[PDB]
Amino acid sequence: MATETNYPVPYRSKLTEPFEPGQTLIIKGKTAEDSVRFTINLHNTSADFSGNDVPLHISVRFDEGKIVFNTFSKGEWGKEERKSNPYKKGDDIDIRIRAHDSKFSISVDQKEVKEYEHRVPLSSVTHFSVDGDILITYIHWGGKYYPVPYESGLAGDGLAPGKSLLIFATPEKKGKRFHINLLKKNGDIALHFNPRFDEKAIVRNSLISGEWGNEEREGKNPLEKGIGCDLEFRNEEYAFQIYVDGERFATYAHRLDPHDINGLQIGGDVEVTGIQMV
Ligand SMILES: CC(=O)N[C@@H]1[C@@H](O)[C@H](O[C@@H]2O[C@H](CO)[C@H](O)[C@H](O)[C@H]2O)[C@@H](CO)O[C@H]1O
Numbered sequence: 202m203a204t205e206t207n208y209p210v211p212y213r214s215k216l217t218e219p220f221e222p223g224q225t226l227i228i229k230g231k232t233a234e235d236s237v238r239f240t241i242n243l244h245n246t247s248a249d250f251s252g253n254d255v256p257l258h259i260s261v262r263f264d265e266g267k268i269v270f271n272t273f274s275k276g277e278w279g280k281e282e283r284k285s286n287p288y289k290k291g292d293d294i295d296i297r298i299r300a301h302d303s304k305f306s307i308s309v310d311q312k313e314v315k316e317y318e319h320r321v322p323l324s325s326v327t328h329f330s331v332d333g334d335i336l337i338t339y340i341h342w343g344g345k346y347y348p349v350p351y352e353s354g355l356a357g358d359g360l361a362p363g364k365s366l367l368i369f370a371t372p373e374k375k376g377k378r379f380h381i382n383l384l385k386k387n388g389d390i391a392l393h394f395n396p397r398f399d400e401k402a403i404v405r406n407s408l409i410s411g412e413w414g415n416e417e418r419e420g421k422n423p424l425e426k427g428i429g430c431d432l433e434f435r436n437e438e439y440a441f442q443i444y445v446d447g448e449r450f451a452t453y454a455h456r457l458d459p460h461d462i463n464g465l466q467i468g469g470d471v472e473v474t475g476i477q478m479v
Contacts, residue, residue, distance in 0.1 A: 239333025311429035359463030376470025
């Protein structure tokens with residue numbers, strides 16, 4: 202045991218509403234040199250009956266060196282399904298579970314590793330728990346099926362200074378490029394974020410009164426076809442701080458007065474699984 206703060210195990214959370222197709226559950230944490238295993242469960246129960254059905258049990262085992270999936274229903278477990286555990290005792294873990302109408306899609310380190318077909322109703326999932334040799338650093342459930350091209354207004358204050366736009370996406374395995382535009386009311390694009398795999402660069406520019414600006418590239422593309430990524434756009438005093446998978450990828454000096462950035466567009470060869478203003 203080391204440090205508590207938030208998300209101490211055993212962690213138990215009652216969902217506000219049913220886990221529905223299109224939603225994702227993200228669990229990040231750290232393990233220790235002596236961690237043996239930890240579990241993640243999507244379980245039934247109305248309030249806290251404890252002992253009901255378990256519509257997806259995930260066991261990450263360091264001893265066995267495998268990630269094991271199973272279901273518990275009507276008082277009994279089914280046959281386990283296994284995949285290799287890419288993690289060594291220690292080092293951080295990143296597990297993501299996305300619900301679909303016929304299965305759960307599980308990713309480890311943002312890489313799809315398992316398609317678990319529903320064995321019992323997904324609607325039975327009313328709670329999720331995490332326990333074992335793990336220190337939880339981040340837990341989030343939400344998202345939906347975002348259609349792309351995508352377009353929407355941003356809150357009432359939009360991407361204002363001191364705030365950040367968080368986007369969870371996966372560039373398509375056979376995609377060439379995709380883009381994310383942060384714009385103003387008149388249609389000017391404050392920031393154009395455009396990953397181009399066929400050019401091995403991410404282009405950043407601004408569209409002002411119908412004309413494209415300079416264009417800032419270079420900085421080694423941190424994205425990869427078919428792998429999930431967490432993109433963060435932090436609106437700061439002098440520039441947008443662009444983070445990719447937790448690391449600052451670049452800075453982009455404001456060319457348009459910040460403030461009043463309440464427009465978002467996403468297009469190209471990409472799948473979007475979550476968008477949030479933090
Ligand atoms: C469909 C569309 O308008 N796409 C444009 C991109 O073509 C454009 O890329 C730049 O294009 C110019 C020529 O017009 C030149 O080739 C640059 O090297 C290239 O980066 C991009 C940036 O202006 O804006 C998109 O909207």
